[PDB]
Amino acid sequence: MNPPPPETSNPNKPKRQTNQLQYLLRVVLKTLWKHQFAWPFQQPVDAVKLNLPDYYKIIKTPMDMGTIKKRLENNYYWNAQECIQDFNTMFTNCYIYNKPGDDIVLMAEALEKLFLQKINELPTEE
Ligand SMILES: Cc1cc(SCc2c(C)noc2C)ncn1
Protein backbone atom coordinates (compact mmCIF):
# COMPACT_ATOMS: atom_id res chain seq x y z
CA MET A 1 0.00 0.00 0.00
CA ASN A 2 1.03 3.66 -0.20
CA PRO A 3 1.40 5.54 3.09
CA PRO A 4 -0.38 8.81 3.69
CA PRO A 5 1.57 11.62 1.95
CA PRO A 6 3.78 14.05 3.86
CA GLU A 7 2.04 16.90 5.65
CA THR A 8 1.36 20.03 3.51
CA SER A 9 -1.15 21.79 5.83
CA ASN A 10 -0.92 22.29 9.60
CA PRO A 11 -2.63 25.39 11.05
CA ASN A 12 -0.82 25.21 14.31
CA LYS A 13 2.65 25.20 12.69
CA PRO A 14 3.87 28.82 12.71
CA LYS A 15 4.58 30.20 9.20
CA ARG A 16 6.64 32.92 7.47
CA GLN A 17 6.77 34.51 3.99
CA THR A 18 10.42 35.53 3.44
CA ASN A 19 12.65 36.53 0.55
CA GLN A 20 14.70 33.25 0.88
CA LEU A 21 11.50 31.16 0.76
CA GLN A 22 10.26 33.25 -2.21
CA TYR A 23 13.59 32.42 -3.99
CA LEU A 24 13.11 28.72 -3.19
CA LEU A 25 9.73 28.86 -5.03
CA ARG A 26 10.43 31.31 -7.89
CA VAL A 27 14.00 30.12 -8.69
CA VAL A 28 14.73 26.71 -7.15
CA LEU A 29 11.44 24.79 -7.45
CA LYS A 30 10.45 26.37 -10.76
CA THR A 31 13.88 25.54 -12.32
CA LEU A 32 13.70 21.88 -11.29
CA TRP A 33 9.96 21.50 -12.04
CA LYS A 34 10.30 22.46 -15.74
CA HIS A 35 13.31 20.15 -16.36
CA GLN A 36 12.89 17.18 -18.69
CA PHE A 37 13.78 14.80 -15.81
CA ALA A 38 11.32 16.30 -13.28
CA TRP A 39 8.37 13.96 -13.89
CA PRO A 40 9.33 11.09 -11.51
CA PHE A 41 9.72 13.67 -8.70
CA GLN A 42 6.54 15.79 -9.25
CA GLN A 43 4.38 13.72 -6.84
CA PRO A 44 4.81 11.16 -4.04
CA VAL A 45 6.19 7.78 -5.16
CA ASP A 46 3.17 5.62 -6.05
CA ALA A 47 4.51 2.22 -4.99
CA VAL A 48 1.29 0.53 -6.20
CA LYS A 49 1.23 1.80 -9.82
CA LEU A 50 5.06 1.59 -10.12
CA ASN A 51 5.20 -1.95 -8.58
CA LEU A 52 7.70 -0.99 -5.86
CA PRO A 53 6.37 -3.06 -2.96
CA ASP A 54 9.60 -2.55 -0.91
CA TYR A 55 9.86 1.25 -1.44
CA TYR A 56 8.21 2.33 1.83
CA LYS A 57 9.89 -0.54 3.72
CA ILE A 58 13.23 1.19 2.87
CA ILE A 59 12.21 4.87 2.64
CA LYS A 60 10.78 6.17 5.94
CA THR A 61 11.02 9.94 5.19
CA PRO A 62 9.40 10.23 1.77
CA MET A 63 9.65 13.56 -0.05
CA ASP A 64 8.89 14.83 -3.55
CA MET A 65 8.62 18.12 -5.44
CA GLY A 66 4.79 17.99 -5.53
CA THR A 67 4.86 18.11 -1.71
CA ILE A 68 7.56 20.84 -1.72
CA LYS A 69 5.57 22.91 -4.28
CA LYS A 70 2.44 22.67 -2.06
CA ARG A 71 4.47 23.56 1.04
CA LEU A 72 5.93 26.65 -0.70
CA GLU A 73 2.64 27.79 -2.36
CA ASN A 74 0.67 27.24 0.87
CA ASN A 75 3.39 28.93 3.11
CA TYR A 76 4.03 25.79 5.23
CA TYR A 77 7.62 26.70 6.16
CA TRP A 78 9.20 28.91 8.81
CA ASN A 79 12.64 29.05 7.15
CA ALA A 80 14.62 28.19 4.02
CA GLN A 81 16.61 25.42 5.77
CA GLU A 82 13.39 23.39 6.20
CA CYS A 83 12.75 23.52 2.44
CA ILE A 84 16.40 22.85 1.51
CA GLN A 85 16.21 19.80 3.79
CA ASP A 86 13.11 18.56 1.91
CA PHE A 87 14.99 18.73 -1.44
CA ASN A 88 17.98 16.93 0.07
CA THR A 89 15.69 14.24 1.55
CA MET A 90 14.14 13.71 -1.90
CA PHE A 91 17.56 13.24 -3.56
CA THR A 92 18.88 11.02 -0.73
CA ASN A 93 15.82 8.76 -0.89
CA CYS A 94 16.41 8.22 -4.60
CA TYR A 95 20.08 7.31 -4.06
CA ILE A 96 19.27 5.06 -1.03
CA TYR A 97 16.49 3.10 -2.81
CA ASN A 98 17.86 2.67 -6.32
CA LYS A 99 20.53 0.54 -7.80
CA PRO A 100 23.59 2.68 -8.45
CA GLY A 101 23.76 4.05 -12.04
CA ASP A 102 20.03 3.51 -12.89
CA ASP A 103 18.24 6.12 -15.05
CA ILE A 104 16.31 7.49 -12.06
CA VAL A 105 19.65 8.14 -10.24
CA LEU A 106 20.99 10.05 -13.29
CA MET A 107 17.73 12.08 -13.32
CA ALA A 108 18.08 12.96 -9.63
CA GLU A 109 21.75 13.90 -10.19
CA ALA A 110 20.82 16.33 -13.02
CA LEU A 111 18.17 18.01 -10.83
CA GLU A 112 20.53 18.07 -7.83
CA LYS A 113 23.25 19.81 -9.89
CA LEU A 114 20.79 22.64 -10.68
CA PHE A 115 19.53 22.68 -7.07
CA LEU A 116 23.11 23.18 -5.82
CA GLN A 117 23.79 25.94 -8.38
CA LYS A 118 20.67 27.83 -7.29
CA ILE A 119 21.17 27.26 -3.49
CA ASN A 120 24.73 28.58 -3.86
CA GLU A 121 23.14 32.02 -4.50
CA LEU A 122 20.40 31.89 -1.88
CA PRO A 123 19.84 35.62 -1.17
CA THR A 124 20.82 37.20 2.14
CA GLU A 125 17.79 37.44 4.44
CA GLU A 126 16.12 40.88 4.19
C1 LIG B 1 12.66 6.43 -14.93
C2 LIG B 1 12.17 5.90 -13.61
C3 LIG B 1 11.12 6.50 -12.93
C4 LIG B 1 10.85 6.02 -11.63
S1 LIG B 1 9.61 6.86 -10.70
C5 LIG B 1 9.73 6.11 -9.05
C6 LIG B 1 11.01 6.35 -8.28
C7 LIG B 1 11.53 7.57 -7.78
C8 LIG B 1 10.97 8.95 -7.92
N1 LIG B 1 12.67 7.39 -7.12
O1 LIG B 1 12.90 5.99 -7.14
C9 LIG B 1 11.90 5.41 -7.88
C10 LIG B 1 12.00 3.95 -8.09
N2 LIG B 1 11.47 4.97 -11.10
C11 LIG B 1 12.43 4.45 -11.87
N3 LIG B 1 12.84 4.85 -13.08
UniProtKB/Swiss-Prot annotation:
There is a cross-link at residue 57 (Glycyl lysine isopeptide (Lys-Gly) (interchain with G-Cter in SUMO2)). It is found in: Nucleus; Chromosome. Residues 16-122 form the Bromo domain. It comes from the Eukaryota. Signal peptide: none annotated. Phosphorylation by CK2 disrupt the intramolecular binding between the bromo domain 2 and the NPS region and promotes binding between the NPS and the BID regions, leading to activate the protein and promote binding to acetylated histones. In absence of phosphorylation, BRD4 does not localize to p53/TP53 target gene promoters, phosphorylation promoting recruitment to p53/TP53 target promoters. Ubiquitously expressed. The record marks 98 as: Acetylated histone binding. It is linked to Cornelia de Lange syndrome 6: A form of Cornelia de Lange syndrome, a clinically heterogeneous developmental disorder associated with malformations affecting multiple systems. It is characterized by facial dysmorphisms, abnormal hands and feet, growth delay, cognitive retardation, hirsutism, gastroesophageal dysfunction and cardiac, ophthalmologic and genitourinary anomalies. CDLS6 inheritance is autosomal dominant. A chromosomal aberration involving BRD4 is found in a rare, aggressive, and lethal carcinoma arising in midline organs of young people. Translocation t(15;19)(q14;p13) with NUTM1 which produces a BRD4-NUTM1 fusion protein. Chromatin reader protein that recognizes and binds acetylated histones and plays a key role in transmission of epigenetic memory across cell divisions and transcription regulation. Remains associated with acetylated chromatin throughout the entire cell cycle and provides epigenetic memory for postmitotic G1 gene transcription by preserving acetylated chromatin status and maintaining high-order chromatin structure. During interphase, plays a key role in regulating the transcription of signal-inducible genes by associating with the P-TEFb complex and recruiting it to promoters. Belongs to the BET family. JQ1, a thieno-triazolo-1,4-diazepine derivative, and I-BET, a benzodiazepine derivative, have been tested on tumors with success. Treatment with GSK1210151A (I-BET151, a I-BET derivative) has strong effets on mixed lineage leukemia and promotes myeloid differentiation and leukemia stem-cell depletion. Interacts with p53/TP53; the interaction is direct. Interacts (via CTD region) with CDK9 and CCNT1, acting as an associated component of P-TEFb complex. Interacts with RELA (when acetylated at 'Lys-310'). Interacts (via NET domain) with NSD3, CHD4, BICRA and ATAD5. The interaction with BICRA bridges BRD4 to the GBAF complex. Interacts (via NET domain) with JMJD6 (via JmjC and N-terminal domains); the interaction is stronger in presence of ssRNA and recruits JMJD6 on distal enhancers. Interacts with NSD3. Interacts with NIPBL. The NET domain mediates interaction with a number of chromatin proteins involved in transcription regulation (NSD3, JMJD6, CHD4, GLTSCR1 and ATAD5). The C-terminal (CTD) region mediates interaction and recruitment of CDK9 and CCNT1 subunits of the P-TEFb complex. It is also required for maintenance of higher-order chromatin structure. This is Bromodomain-containing protein 4. It comes from Homo sapiens. The lineage of its organism: Eukaryota, Metazoa, Chordata, Craniata, Vertebrata. The gene is BRD4. The chain holds residues 44 to 168 of 1362 of the full protein.
